[PDB]
Amino acid sequence: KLNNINFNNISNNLNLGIEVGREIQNASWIKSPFFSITGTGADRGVRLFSVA
């Protein structure tokens, strides 16, 4: 076992240093159609009552 085929992709190259992404990007993007219904006026579909 001296000169056999090594199936070692470039991930097994000890000259490469990995670089980690500069920012962790967020996997959350969705907005829902409820912030616009909600309100204080009596006409709103979801009415907020101010209660001290």
């Binding site: 992709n9 991930s11 990995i18 670089e19 980690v20 990007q25 967020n26 996997a27 969705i30 907005k31």
Partner: protein, 319 residues
């Protein structure tokens, strides 16, 4: 310093939380962070000329022609890598016997909410664009993905009754002026539908189960991927449920494929072959291509764990 790149995503919380007076520690939430590593790959091609007297005899300008040819070969290798990584082992896909607008809609809202072909609950796919529009007085957000169909699939979609209905509607309305005339597919549900071609030996297109395993596999990095399901193996998988070849398209959202490094190419012109008579023109590239597919950093099972981040497969019988 085009080292292997590691981008990371922050999963979002799905925990029950804690009720009225129970303590936080009774149900902590996990801050699951996921990562991928994109290793580069080196590939290139060369052209050796004839003797100088023979090139000016046959009136072939070898440097010009070889640079042009190698530029084209290089662009096609790049895109074939992007598409091969984009189309192996779909974790999420829909199979239909003939492409139609119903299946494109199914895919678009499967991506909008997060669902799988078995009507499961995966994760919402981030779109290429997402805007706040106003229906009457309610602010909704509408998404725009990119649907890359195979040309057999675009030909199936053109002969679809509801697609003709929708083109009639657009005509009465007047927005996609010049798509049905120009043979294009236009926008369906805010999402541009594109005939992306057919994969052949000369240029890139959406693959099909007619391609050979080795011919498809020589375009995967094999350090950037975990498993490998070629279109032929994917056809065998879908066959376990008759002898029809399949055709593959993709709904893609933002960052479905990640390119690390420098997609620029290098040209090596050696005018010193055979003491200066002959000539060599080489073109080389080092590029990391990977389908966006993040793995759990520590150990945790998560909807994002071994799943295509922004790719739904769209499989139809190529006929």
């Amino acid at each position: 310093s085009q080292q292997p790149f590691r981008p990371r995503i922050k999963a979002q919380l799905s925990g029950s939380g804690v009720s009225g007076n129970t303590d936080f520690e009774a149900n902590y939430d996990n801050l699951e962070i996921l990562s991928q590593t994109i290793y580069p790959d080196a590939f290139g091609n060369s052209l050796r000329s004839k003797i100088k007297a023979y090139s000016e005899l046959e009136r072939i300008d070898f440097i010009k022609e070889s640079v042009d040819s190698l530029t084209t070969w290089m662009n096609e290798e790049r895109d074939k890598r992007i598409v091969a990584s984009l189309t192996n082992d779909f974790t999420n896909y829909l199979y239909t016997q003939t492409m139609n607008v119903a299946t494109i809609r199914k895919a678009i809202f499967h991506a909008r909410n997060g669902l799988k072909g078995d009507n499961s609950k995966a994760f919402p796919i981030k779109p290429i664009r997402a805007t706040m529009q106003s229906v009457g007085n309610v602010m909704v957000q509408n998404t725009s993905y990119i649907i890359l169909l195979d040309s057999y699939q675009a030909n199936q979609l053109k002969a679809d009754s509801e697609f003709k209905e929708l083109r009639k509607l657009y005509a009465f309305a007047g927005e996609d002026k010049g798509m049905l005339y120009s043979g294009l597919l236009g926008v369906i549900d805010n999402c541009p539908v594109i005939d992306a071609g057919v994969w052949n030996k000369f240029n890139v297109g959406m693959p099909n189960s007619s391609i050979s395993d080795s011919d498809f596999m020589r375009y995967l990095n094999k350090a950037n991927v975990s498993s490998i399901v070629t279109p032929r193996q994917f056809k065998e998988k879908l066959n376990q449920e008759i002898n029809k070849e399949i055709s593959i398209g993709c709904l893609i959202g933002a960052s479905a494929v990640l390119l690390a490094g420098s997609k620029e190419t290098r040209f090596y012109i050696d005018e010193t072959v055979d003491a200066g008579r002959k000539s060599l023109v080489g073109v080389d590239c080092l590029l990391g291509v990977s389908k966006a597919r993040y793995q759990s950093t520590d150990g945790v099972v998560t909807p994002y764990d071994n799943q295509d981040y922004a790719v739904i497969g769209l499989v139809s019988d190529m006929e």
